[PDB]
Design a protein around this ligand. Sequence first.
Ligand SMILES: CCCCCCCCCCCCCCCCCC(=O)OC[C@H](COP(=O)([O-])OCC(O)COP(=O)([O-])OC[C@@H](COC(=O)CCCCCCCCCCCCCCCCC)OC(=O)CCCCCCCCCCCCCCCCC)OC(=O)CCCCCCCCCCCCCCCCC
Ligand code: BCL
Ligand SMILES: COC(C)(C)C/C=C/C(C)=C/C=C/C(C)=C/C=C/C(C)=C/C=C/C=C(C)/C=C/C=C(\C)CC/C=C(\C)CCC=C(C)C
Ligand SMILES: COC(C)(C)C/C=C/C(C)=C/C=C/C(C)=C/C=C/C(C)=C/C=C/C=C(C)/C=C/C=C(\C)CC/C=C(\C)CCC=C(C)C
Ligand SMILES: COC(C)(C)C/C=C/C(C)=C/C=C/C(C)=C/C=C/C(C)=C/C=C/C=C(C)/C=C/C=C(\C)CC/C=C(\C)CCC=C(C)C
Ligand SMILES: COC(C)(C)C/C=C/C(C)=C/C=C/C(C)=C/C=C/C(C)=C/C=C/C=C(C)/C=C/C=C(\C)CC/C=C(\C)CCC=C(C)C
Ligand SMILES: COC(C)(C)C/C=C/C(C)=C/C=C/C(C)=C/C=C/C(C)=C/C=C\C=C(C)\C=C\C=C(/C)CC/C=C(\C)CCC=C(C)C
Ligand SMILES: [Fe+2]
Lengths: 65, 65, 44, 44, 44, 44, 260, 305, 54, 54, 46, 46, 54, 281
Amino acid sequence: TIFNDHLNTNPKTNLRLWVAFQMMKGAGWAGGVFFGTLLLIGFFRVVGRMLPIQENQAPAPNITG
Amino acid sequence: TIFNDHLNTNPKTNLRLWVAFQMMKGAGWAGGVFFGTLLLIGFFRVVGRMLPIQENQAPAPNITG
Amino acid sequence: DLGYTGLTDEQAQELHSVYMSGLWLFSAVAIVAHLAVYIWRPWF
Amino acid sequence: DLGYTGLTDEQAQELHSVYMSGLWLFSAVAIVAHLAVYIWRPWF
Amino acid sequence: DLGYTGLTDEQAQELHSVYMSGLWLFSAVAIVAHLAVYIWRPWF
Amino acid sequence: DLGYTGLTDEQAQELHSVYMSGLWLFSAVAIVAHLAVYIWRPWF
Amino acid sequence: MVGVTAFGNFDLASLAIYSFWIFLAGLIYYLQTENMREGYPLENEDGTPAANQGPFPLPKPKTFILPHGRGTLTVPGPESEDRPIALARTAVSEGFPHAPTGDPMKDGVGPASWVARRDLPELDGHGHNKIKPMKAAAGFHVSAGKNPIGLPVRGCDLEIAGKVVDIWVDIPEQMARFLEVELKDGSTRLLPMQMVKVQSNRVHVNALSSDLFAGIPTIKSPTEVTLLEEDKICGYVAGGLMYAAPKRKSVVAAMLAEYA
Amino acid sequence: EYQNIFSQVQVRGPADLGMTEDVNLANRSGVGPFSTLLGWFGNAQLGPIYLGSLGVLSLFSGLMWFFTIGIWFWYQAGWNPAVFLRDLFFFSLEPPAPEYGLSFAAPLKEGGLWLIASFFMFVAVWSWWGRTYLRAQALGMGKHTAWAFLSAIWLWMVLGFIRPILMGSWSEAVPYGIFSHLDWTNNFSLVHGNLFYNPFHGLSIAFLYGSALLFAMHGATILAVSRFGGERELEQIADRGTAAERAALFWRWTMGFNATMEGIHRWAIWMAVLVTLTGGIGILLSGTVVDNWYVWGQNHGMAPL
Amino acid sequence: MSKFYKIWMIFDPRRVFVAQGVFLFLLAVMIHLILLSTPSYNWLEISAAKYNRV
Amino acid sequence: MSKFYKIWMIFDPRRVFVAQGVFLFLLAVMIHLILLSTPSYNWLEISAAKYNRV
Amino acid sequence: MSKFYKIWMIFDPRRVFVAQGVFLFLLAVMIHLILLSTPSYNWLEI
Amino acid sequence: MSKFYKIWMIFDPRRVFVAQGVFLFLLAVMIHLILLSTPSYNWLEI
Amino acid sequence: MSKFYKIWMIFDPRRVFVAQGVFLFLLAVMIHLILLSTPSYNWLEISAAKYNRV
Amino acid sequence: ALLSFERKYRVPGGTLVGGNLFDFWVGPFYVGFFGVATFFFAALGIILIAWSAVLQGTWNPQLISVYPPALEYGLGGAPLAKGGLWQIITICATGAFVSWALREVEICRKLGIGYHIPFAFAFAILAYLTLVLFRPVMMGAWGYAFPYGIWTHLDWVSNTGYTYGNFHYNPAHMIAISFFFTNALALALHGALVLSAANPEKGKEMRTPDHEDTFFRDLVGYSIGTLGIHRLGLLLSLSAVFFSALCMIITGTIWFDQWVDWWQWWVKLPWWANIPGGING
Ligand SMILES: CCCCCCCCCCCCCCCCCC(=O)OC[C@H](COP(=O)([O-])OCC(O)COP(=O)([O-])OC[C@@H](COC(=O)CCCCCCCCCCCCCCCCC)OC(=O)CCCCCCCCCCCCCCCCC)OC(=O)CCCCCCCCCCCCCCCCC
Ligand code: BCL
Ligand SMILES: COC(C)(C)C/C=C/C(C)=C/C=C/C(C)=C/C=C/C(C)=C/C=C/C=C(C)/C=C/C=C(\C)CC/C=C(\C)CCC=C(C)C
Ligand SMILES: COC(C)(C)C/C=C/C(C)=C/C=C/C(C)=C/C=C/C(C)=C/C=C/C=C(C)/C=C/C=C(\C)CC/C=C(\C)CCC=C(C)C
Ligand SMILES: COC(C)(C)C/C=C/C(C)=C/C=C/C(C)=C/C=C/C(C)=C/C=C/C=C(C)/C=C/C=C(\C)CC/C=C(\C)CCC=C(C)C
Ligand SMILES: COC(C)(C)C/C=C/C(C)=C/C=C/C(C)=C/C=C/C(C)=C/C=C/C=C(C)/C=C/C=C(\C)CC/C=C(\C)CCC=C(C)C
Ligand SMILES: COC(C)(C)C/C=C/C(C)=C/C=C/C(C)=C/C=C/C(C)=C/C=C\C=C(C)\C=C\C=C(/C)CC/C=C(\C)CCC=C(C)C
Ligand SMILES: [Fe+2]
């Protein structure tokens, strides 16, 4: 790195940003998983919208009461 | 800093966290302002709740239509 | 001195202090959010 | 070659590249959120 | 002397003391919460 | 004297004594709880 | 016989179901007992027998009479591994990793491990050797797919460490087993086929890099391969996946390492 | 990564005529062609097949069974090739009606042909079982294949022979036809209450699911350790290698217990045999002892009422 | 009763203590759920009736 | 009770602390879900009945 | 488009990044307010 | 409570911080679902 | 009856004691659940009727 | 504790997340980060099923049932007592299965073997998600998923099958059933062949793979080989599960009628649709 304008910050704040970064690695991975799951559910919901399920429509398989 | 376990990351990611940090300084200040404003409004709303404004209640000062 | 991770006393104190500063910052933001929600609509 | 800031060509390219990586990450998160909202409830 | 983990007597006492301090802190917070809930709405 | 785990007589007695102290402490807390519940609402 | 009960609701349906529960318990016991013929008794991490042996006792020994006058294998029996393991324990308590003391791949520990089998080739049904180079086999020829003979061999670091000379095939089984890959040292090494990706112009080896091709354990005799040295070659090639991870030019690995 | 699902280069040479102990080679045919298509997955060589006394018996009986059903199908289409083409899955060779009971007095056209075809099928299947036993015996091998086949034959016999005799009617065997035998299955379930509440039906389903489970597990394990020569299993039983150890350690660290190169096949054979064993028992009890399985389940703590 | 201590020359303490902890927690959960299942001794419903909650 | 500390000459602190954290979080989630399931002590529904959200 | 990078030989990164953070937060709060104002897309309902 | 800091002579910070981030995000998403499930405190109705 | 002790030259104490503990706990749970199932000897219901908790 | 040969394999590394935070064993079990996660999820799910037993009112293990929300709740949440416990248990089960697959990846990876096993488990996970997540979401309500009961999810199977008449006439269904039956047949034959080679006529020498090929070529005339049989087993099982997921994803979504009505198209094809005679016409 030739920028040499960020290197002037004190070592304590370097540590600070290091661990802010550790936590955003961890839970950015977790967020990617959760929101990819929602996008998958959304794809299936759209496919369900475009199909004529919504006109001829099945009875309940199980009682639930 | 004696930790010496964060210093092993490459300089490019040090730059990365440096500017992630710049942006969270800026807009953490902005968030503090916005949410302090909401807490002030909430304090006034609570004081309004506990007072008997809600029983004897003023007519509209201006027409608005 | 167990030293499973290899850190010393001063390193441990420094890391724990910066952790706790971050933890209390997170806690303060959480308390502000909780008060905002409580004022907006109480759950008790 | 104006250098009001004082940066050189290589420094400029490096900083701009890391900026743009951050910008496209932000944009990708925004696109995911927008698709989620659009699927949940369209505005068109 | 029985030894399975590698720790000595003094290390064991130190670790157990700091554990128990944490345990009683956790217990105190739990008791405060339980009293708050009990006063708010008893279950007996 | 078997020697399946590798402990000696004195180690066995020491470990069993501290176990039994813990066991009787657990039992005492259980008896206090049981008396409290019985007084509050008997099951006999 | 529809619906008469011996007692309560107990009929042939109930008798059959309970008999099956008992039979299933017995069968599960028998199956686990048969599966306790390798690796037992259990042992501490320091080699001494554990206080654990399990709810299931060891079975009575049975004898396999090996073919071609190889002898007899009787199991369960006394198992030692007839080789030294270069590992040092990390903790005093149990259930923790043992770190390698020297070079891990090459003392042969971890994913690079191997087992002291018989230093003899395995034989086919008729007594000949089972695995054999193309030149030593009579009538065999590459029959479909991209013939790998004559192609360069590229390692995981995007260098070419040698190039393919011959194929070792498995005679009764009629399938290719090793690539004889020859370096510009001039000596030849053996490559398991399931560790090599044969492409149109190039034989890719994800496991190893160029500098590790020379270290592959060579073969005692130049037309045959024994079981011991098959373990030895396979274990090193496979342990290359973890122990040559740094030297590897993978986009996703560099991605994650730069982030990490 | 090479996944070892398909061979990437093939080789071939002289055909393998096979081992020659206690086998009469006058009956073994000549090796057939090599298939490049089959070679991408397994062996490419076809043949030689052994043709013995039981082989001819089984071939004759099975060919006549298939031919009898086919001739009835042709009659049932009015001898029209187009109708035969279009209704191939709808034709059926149906057993005698209930009023004949077990008697062989049913006319040719409501079940005499069914009886003839069933006799041919009986002879064919039992001849094939004997042939399995003798082919195992000739090479000095164990008879495990014969006993697993015997389990399958037990279910087949219960379905077609033993249960009709117990119920005193040929009308309760299975018709020869694709959709017709599927409807026989569905109507068997409907008549006796849910077979879902037959406990041996549930056990049979458990062991079929377990077969799919165990055999995906085992195929995946062997393909994962095939980099150490894991697919050569008889030799790993003979002289344990690192493939066997790595497989055992994977399953031990995953679920707390493992098997042996030898013993996983005992698991496999028993898992597959129990399917038809419990199925035969359940079908035999179905109708003979219980004729409403849902009520039985209510009586046995299985259904809510 | 005096020499029951020799059980520890039979059993490894680590395994026994893990098993004992698991067993005790499972038993306590068992008994609490059994109490919660019965209309009486389901302390929740009983209190909800006492203080006229529901 | 004084020498309970010798448990740490039996058990490795790392494994014990991981197990304890998992156990405590699981128990807390258990109890919160049990409270949420009952019509009373489901603090959500109770506060919605207090403030007329239904 | 390729040589937009030289914007950083014009502007000091520190100041630009502070301004950009403030701007982005303010814009997000703005839009969440426009959505909150309309009877639909006001999620804070119920 | 004063010497809780020695936990970091037991645990490597990197691993602990990754695990803690994952845990906190998962817990927040959990609680959002709990709020979303009840007819009141569900903001996705509108 | 005097030399029953020779059973321990037949059986390993560890395995026998584990099996015995499992067996005894399972039998006790068996009998307690059988008692709870019958309307009488279900001590819970009997107490509830005695003090009129319903 | 350890198998006779296990110690030379217990090395650090080969794990996706968490370095050596959880890179240790508990008995034989390897823990890891995803082992911690899967233990949490499995424990919570089993507990919540027990709490369902308490709320429902039975302690009979064969009568405990956790029903999904009814149809009127749509795809939203339900009260814990009437459909929310099912949703939490479903999330716990999905998390447990996925963590189990990732833990298997970590173990495969410490041992230096291929990832065929977590591959194949992902197929079962996707079939479960088809039944529980994809189809009910595509179809409008959580009430189309099955309850968590030993004998009550069989009721779900029966009702769903008979909504479309005889479900035997689903074609992807027939393909899946043929794959399942072929898989069981192949498993029996393979186990028998290997056992008979390793355990020959009684006291004579152990057999060779050549004997296995000879036996099976004598039997039917084409041996597939050891590698072939293991490939065929993995592929038969995976194809069966894939076609199950397909036959259920298309049901009630693009097909709404009796399935024999689907089979009706071949009969009505132009060059035989009008001929008299036969079963049809
Ligand atoms: C004392 C107190 C009283 C107590 C009473 C209660 C007892 C409780 C027992 C609990 C269970 C214990 C464990 C049982 C499993 C043990 C397996 C074992 O030990 O394997 C060793 C042995 C291993 O052989 P190997 O060492 O590999 O061979 C090496 C040699 O060199 C080469 O040897 P080889 O090649 O020559 O192989 C020969 C041998 C080896 O077999 C194999 O290779 C393995 C094949 C596995 C598949 C076998 C199943 C085939 C099913 C046949 C027909 C099924 C329908 C039957 C009708 C259903 C029942 C109504 O073949 C067989 O043994 C199978 C013969 C099958 C005939 C079945 C006839 C009808 C049932 C009659 C019962 C007696 C059966 C024979 C018993 C004696 C056997 C010597 O394999 C066996 O002996 C198989 C055992 C067969 C057991 C019976 C099979 C049917 C079971 C029915 C269950 C029904 C439950 C009730 C429900 C309904 C009730 C109304
Ligand atoms: C509405 C329909 C009913 C129902 C009605 C029945 C009936 C009726 C029966 C089954 C049976 C079975 N069902 Mg059920 N079944 C239902 C729902 C299910 C469901 C599900 C998820 O819904 C599943 C997974 C199953 C699964 C199963 C299997 C476990 C079992 C068959 C074992 C087998 O392989 O037989 C197939 C294997 C054979 C038939 C053996 C054949 C052996 C012979 C030797 C083969 C000879 C071949 C011949 C000569 C041809 C040669 C060809 C040439 C060589 C090419 N059913 C519902 C409740 N099911 C059977 C059983 O055992 O039940 C207890 C049975 O009879
Ligand atoms: C079903 O049951 C329900 C869910 C309904 C109820 C159950 C609830 C459960 C049981 C509640 C469980 C709660 C858990 C236990 C709460 C734990 C919270 C943890 C402890 C929070 C810790 C946070 C730590 C913070 C994020 C640490 C931050 C460390 C810093 C990032 C390091 C650097 C700090 C420097 C940069 C200086 C600070 C300034 C910055 C920008 C952070
Ligand atoms: C009333 O009018 C309404 C509101 C209704 C409509 C009006 C809308 C207005 C007009 C829209 C205006 C939109 C403006 C123009 C959009 C501008 C957006 C800006 C340009 C987005 C730029 C974002 C830059 C990103 C955040 C840059 C990030 C740089 C990083 C922080 C530097 C390091 C990168 C790292 C941290 C990320 C990747 C590497 C790691 C370690 C994760
Ligand atoms: C369905 O059943 C229901 C739910 C109704 C009833 C269920 C009942 C069940 C049985 C309840 C079970 C309760 C359990 C038994 C309660 C156990 C509580 C205790 C054992 C938990 C202990 C907590 C203590 C924790 C908070 C420790 C905290 C200490 C940390 C802050 C740091 C200390 C760690 C080390 C020692 C410090 C650094 C070491 C240096 C010296 C190197
Ligand atoms: C349906 O069934 C129902 C529920 C109705 C009825 C069920 C009935 C069943 C049968 C009830 C079963 C009850 C069981 C048998 C009760 C067993 C109780 C005893 C055995 C549990 C033991 C408790 C003792 C524990 C608390 C030990 C605590 C000691 C620790 C604090 C530390 C001590 C550990 C070592 C020795 C200390 C350090 C060692 C040094 C020397 C290195
Ligand atoms: C153009 O093509 C031609 C005409 C040349 C040939 C083509 C023929 C095609 C159309 C053949 C079609 C065959 C059908 C489709 C095969 C279907 C078979 C069905 C699926 C079999 C399913 C179940 C049958 C099993 C259960 C039968 C079991 C019966 C055994 C237990 C033997 C029964 C024992 C009998 C009753 C004993 C009677 C003894 C004598 C005295 C009558
Ligand atoms: Fe195999």
